[PDB]
Enzyme design. Structure first.
Site, short mmCIF file in Angstrom:
data_model
loop_
_atom_site.label_atom_id
_atom_site.label_comp_id
_atom_site.label_asym_id
_atom_site.label_seq_id
_atom_site.Cartn_x
_atom_site.Cartn_y
_atom_site.Cartn_z
N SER B 48 0.80 -1.23 0.00
CA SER B 48 0.00 0.00 0.00
C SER B 48 0.84 1.29 0.00
O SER B 48 0.36 2.34 -0.52
CB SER B 48 -0.99 0.03 1.15
OG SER B 48 -1.87 -1.09 1.01
N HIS B 51 1.60 1.83 -3.46
CA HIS B 51 0.40 2.33 -4.15
C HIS B 51 0.34 3.86 -4.11
O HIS B 51 -0.22 4.46 -5.02
CB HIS B 51 -0.90 1.74 -3.53
CG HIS B 51 -1.16 0.31 -3.86
ND1 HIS B 51 -0.56 -0.37 -4.92
CD2 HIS B 51 -1.98 -0.59 -3.25
CE1 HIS B 51 -1.03 -1.61 -4.95
NE2 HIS B 51 -1.90 -1.76 -3.97
N1 LIG Z 1 -7.16 -4.61 3.29
C1 LIG Z 1 -6.10 -4.04 3.96
O1 LIG Z 1 -6.17 -3.58 5.08
C2 LIG Z 1 -4.79 -4.05 3.30
C3 LIG Z 1 -4.64 -4.33 1.89
N2 LIG Z 1 -3.39 -4.36 1.31
C4 LIG Z 1 -3.33 -4.69 -0.11
O2 LIG Z 1 -3.19 -6.08 -0.26
C5 LIG Z 1 -2.47 -6.34 -1.49
C6 LIG Z 1 -1.31 -7.28 -1.22
O3 LIG Z 1 -0.32 -6.54 -0.45
P1 LIG Z 1 1.13 -7.19 -0.25
O4 LIG Z 1 1.03 -8.63 0.13
O5 LIG Z 1 1.90 -6.26 0.59
O6 LIG Z 1 1.65 -7.08 -1.78
P2 LIG Z 1 2.68 -7.85 -2.69
O7 LIG Z 1 3.83 -8.31 -1.87
O8 LIG Z 1 2.87 -6.97 -3.88
O9 LIG Z 1 1.89 -9.17 -3.10
C7 LIG Z 1 0.99 -9.27 -4.21
C8 LIG Z 1 1.22 -10.58 -4.93
O10 LIG Z 1 0.24 -10.66 -6.00
C9 LIG Z 1 0.85 -11.32 -7.08
N3 LIG Z 1 0.12 -11.04 -8.30
C10 LIG Z 1 0.19 -9.90 -9.07
N4 LIG Z 1 -0.64 -9.96 -10.09
C11 LIG Z 1 -1.27 -11.19 -10.02
C12 LIG Z 1 -0.79 -11.88 -8.91
N5 LIG Z 1 -1.17 -13.11 -8.50
C13 LIG Z 1 -2.10 -13.66 -9.29
N6 LIG Z 1 -2.60 -13.07 -10.41
C14 LIG Z 1 -2.24 -11.84 -10.85
N7 LIG Z 1 -2.73 -11.37 -11.97
C15 LIG Z 1 2.30 -10.84 -7.07
O11 LIG Z 1 3.15 -11.64 -7.87
C16 LIG Z 1 2.60 -10.76 -5.57
O12 LIG Z 1 3.28 -11.91 -5.05
C17 LIG Z 1 -2.05 -4.96 -2.07
O13 LIG Z 1 -3.04 -4.50 -2.98
C18 LIG Z 1 -2.14 -4.06 -0.84
O14 LIG Z 1 -2.34 -2.70 -1.15
C19 LIG Z 1 -2.24 -4.53 2.21
C20 LIG Z 1 -2.32 -4.29 3.52
C21 LIG Z 1 -3.55 -3.69 4.13
N8 LIG Z 1 -3.43 -1.97 3.89
C22 LIG Z 1 -4.53 -1.23 3.58
C23 LIG Z 1 -3.98 0.03 3.62
I1 LIG Z 1 -5.07 1.77 3.20
C24 LIG Z 1 -2.64 0.04 3.94
N9 LIG Z 1 -2.32 -1.27 4.11
ZN LIG Z 2 -0.38 -2.06 4.76
#
Ligand SMILES: [N]C(=O)C1=[C][N+]([C]2O[C]([C]OP(=O)([O-])OP(=O)([O-])O[C][C]3O[C](N4[C]=NC5=C4N=[C][N+]=C5[N])[C]([O])[C]3[O])[C]([O])[C]2[O])=[C][C]=C1N1=[C]C(I)=[C][N]1
Ligand SMILES: [Zn+2]
Ligand SMILES: [N]C(=O)C1=[C][N+]([C]2O[C]([C]OP(=O)([O-])OP(=O)([O-])O[C][C]3O[C](N4[C]=NC5=C4N=[C][N+]=C5[N])[C]([O])[C]3[O])[C]([O])[C]2[O])=[C][C]=C1N1=[C]C(I)=[C][N]1
Ligand SMILES: [Zn+2]
Ligand SMILES: [Zn+2]
Ligand SMILES: [Zn+2]
Lengths: 374, 374
Positions: B48, B51
């Site tokens: 995350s 992310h």
């Molecule tokens: N619900 C809550 O609280 C949460 C959520 N988160 C989430 O979950 C997921 C997972 O994480 P992790 O275990 O750390 O990661 P990684 O080491 O990168 O592992 C993944 C896996 O998967 C695979 N793939 C890719 N693409 C595909 C696959 N398989 C089958 N098929 C397909 N197409 C690779 O190769 C690897 O091994 C994520 O989404 C995250 O974000 C975590 C924890 C907790 N949080 C919430 C918050 I605002 C902060 N933290």
């Molecule tokens: Zn986390």
């Protein structure tokens, strides 16, 4: 006098979609091994039967529809052990074979022998017992209750109390048990909770009955037809709302009314949009939403999975989650013991010959359940 | 000694998406009423946090990320009663205010004071405690653990065992508790059941741990990176499958393998398609599927509601459904008593200063959890 013989009788045949039922003479074969031939006494008009007419629900045509009914056993095939000629019975549109993984599971009721998932429109053995004008006619859900006589597989019939009033308890064959079980068994509505019920037809009213039985403190009925509100309140709704009255989406309204979302919601209409709305209006961390309505064939909904990630539960069920053969006789016993009421669901009682008139009442919004009498 | 004073320290600031973190000096204000300033000791790299970099998880920039961590209280603001200077603590990315409807509900854990639903990137009071180059920097999930010092609201910190090893138990602040609780608390995996786990990273391995702890008979790991399979088997997977090896969609493969669908499935990746596949592969009448992965911001999935109407249950959860402040100290106590293991999750250890190398290891597929030490 008819045992072992072909019966000629009246049935309501649907030759093609989007046409009236044709009331005419059909031939009903005698029951083969493990089959039961029933003289129909009463059958309800469920919206799911209209779905066959409208093409919302796809099943092979031509067909004898009808799945909510009660009647009396006329004869039994070889090897039948659970009913006898003369017994009162309710056909089970969800079977209970007792042998499959679903039947053995403590929660499941969607028995693998169902004809719902991949409709064939036949008896278990892949053939039909119905002929009309020399052509074979399909079964529907293994029940086909729009006929003076039907043949069903043993796993699709339950014996019920010999004293029960068939013109009322036919509703236990679908509408009442589906709604009531959706609340008490599938959702497991809790005491003091707030519930929202989308759709106030026969099934939605039965959901309300279940929510009230479960002790919900608030039950909000939602329908675009305000004529449905009075009966919803009679059976337990605390408040009713019509989405058309509001300038904002009803999920926002229901969330505000419930000070942050309802505990339980139920979709009891059959529309993709109201399924998503009903999910959205349940509290985001702990709400539960149950899909009961049947949507149009092969259409997908669109939703944001964050609605689930916060903690919501979404589920659906057929027939209120009830294992059908076990549950139907007990529901009838409970009715006979005055544990619930069926009269609130019945708005019209008509002779079977008026089936089309009964469907017209449903479509126009005027009826809840019409019971057809043979 | 630093109580009441601004602290200058190093943090990893993210000035823009899709760029390396910048390790540089920030100013960390002293805690206001009901706030706690923590000297960080260890922090894990969760997907995350990545992310945020990728724009999958949207939160205001510039930001100090980090949410899986452990440290020692440096000072407390006026009114704090639940921790003291010198206590070992884990920041809680899901708060537990103890007063809202969700905190009071037996099942709910997504406390209404969270900064996930409508992210502001601030303290509870709507302001920031971080300055960098004279500019205010956002918080992340109320925790911002990628810093030698952070300040958190009291509802976002838990006191833990004085003897706990912080370089291990930081994982209880996210990946272990999330995965394990998704199995044991959210799905409620049963003894003898078949589970499928999609994604075998830190969180998916923790789901496997939970499924095994709950007594599942079969635990099928699913990943497109076969290098993840050996460790999955070590912590309890009975078999692993790579969708890339099959001509058929993996929901079909999994349904075949489980003789008609699994009891419990888990999406632990964060893709819309695998969320739908994981629901599909659970048994249609009684299966349960839990979404754990975080989907790309504002995108909707498409699905057929018939998957639910047959009887499936679909749900999701943050932080394994655990009420955070109650649960974190208990989870640490259980770890100290050897009730579960954290070492299988830790594949790499680096100094905080090599945070970017730690992110490279995650993105290459090489690591499960890298723990960064301050
Ligand atoms: N619900 C809550 O609280 C949460 C959520 N988160 C989430 O979950 C997921 C997972 O994480 P992790 O275990 O750390 O990661 P990684 O080491 O990168 O592992 C993944 C896996 O998967 C695979 N793939 C890719 N693409 C595909 C696959 N398989 C089958 N098929 C397909 N197409 C690779 O190769 C690897 O091994 C994520 O989404 C995250 O974000 C975590 C924890 C907790 N949080 C919430 C918050 I605002 C902060 N933290
Ligand atoms: Zn986390
Ligand atoms: N699940 C199961 O089992 C089932 C199902 N189903 C379904 O459900 C639904 C309902 O039904 P009913 O109740 O019968 O119907 P009605 O009467 O028609 O009612 C409805 C309602 O709703 C409303 N709306 C409309 N639209 C709308 C509304 N609301 C709101 N909003 C909107 N938009 C109206 O008005 C009325 O009142 C359906 O879907 C059906 O189908 C039933 C039963 C059961 N089944 C199944 C089967 I295969 C057979 N049966
Ligand atoms: Zn069965
Ligand atoms: Zn029905
Ligand atoms: Zn709270």
């Amino acid at each position: 006098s008819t045992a072992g013989k072909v019966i000629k009788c009246k049935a309501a045949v649907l030759w093609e979609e989007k046409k009236p039922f044709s009331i005419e003479e059909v031939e009903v074969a005698p029951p083969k091994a493990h089959e039961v031939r029933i003289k129909m006494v009463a059958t309800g008009i469920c919206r799911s039967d209209d779905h066959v007419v409208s093409g919302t629900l796809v099943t092979p045509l031509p067909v004898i529809a009808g799945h909510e009914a009660a009647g009396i056993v006329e004869s039994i095939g070889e090897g039948v052990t659970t009913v006898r000629p003369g017994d009162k019975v309710i056909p089970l549109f969800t079977p209970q074979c007792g042998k499959c993984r679903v039947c053995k599971h403590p929660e499941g009721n969607f028995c693998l022998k169902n004809d719902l998932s991949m409709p064939r429109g036949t008896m278990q053995d892949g053939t039909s017992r119905f002929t009309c004008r020399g052509k074979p006619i399909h079964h529907f859900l293994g029940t086909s209750t729009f006929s003076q006589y039907t043949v069903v597989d043993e796993i699709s019939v339950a014996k019920i109390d010999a004293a029960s009033p068939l013109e009322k308890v036919c509703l236990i064959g679908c509408g009442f048990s589906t709604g009531y079980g959706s609340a008490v068994k599938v959702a497991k509505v809790t005491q003091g909770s707030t519930c929202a019920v989308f759709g106030l037809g026969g099934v939605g009213l039965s959901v309300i009955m279940g929510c009230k039985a479960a002790g919900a403190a608030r039950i909000i009925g939602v329908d675009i037809n305000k004529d449905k509100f009075a009966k919803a309140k009679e059976v337990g709704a605390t408040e009713c709302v019509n989405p058309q009255d509001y300038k904002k989406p009803i999920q926002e309204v229901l969330t505000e009314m419930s000070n942050g979302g309802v505990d339980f919601s139920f979709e009891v209409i059959g529309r993709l949009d109201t399924m998503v709305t009903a999910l959205s209006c349940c509290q985001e961390a702990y709400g539960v939403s149950v899909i009961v309505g049947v949507p149009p064939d092969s259409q997908n909904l669109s939703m944001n999975p964050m609605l689930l990630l916060s903690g919501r539960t979404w589920k659906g069920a057929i027939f209120g989650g009830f294992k059908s053969k076990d549950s139907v006789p007990k529901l009838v016993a409970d009715f006979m013991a005055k544990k619930f009421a069926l009269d609130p669901l019945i708005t019209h009682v008509l002779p079977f010959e008026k089936i089309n008139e009964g469907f017209d009442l449903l479509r126009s919004g005027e009826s809840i359940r019409t019971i057809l009498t043979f």
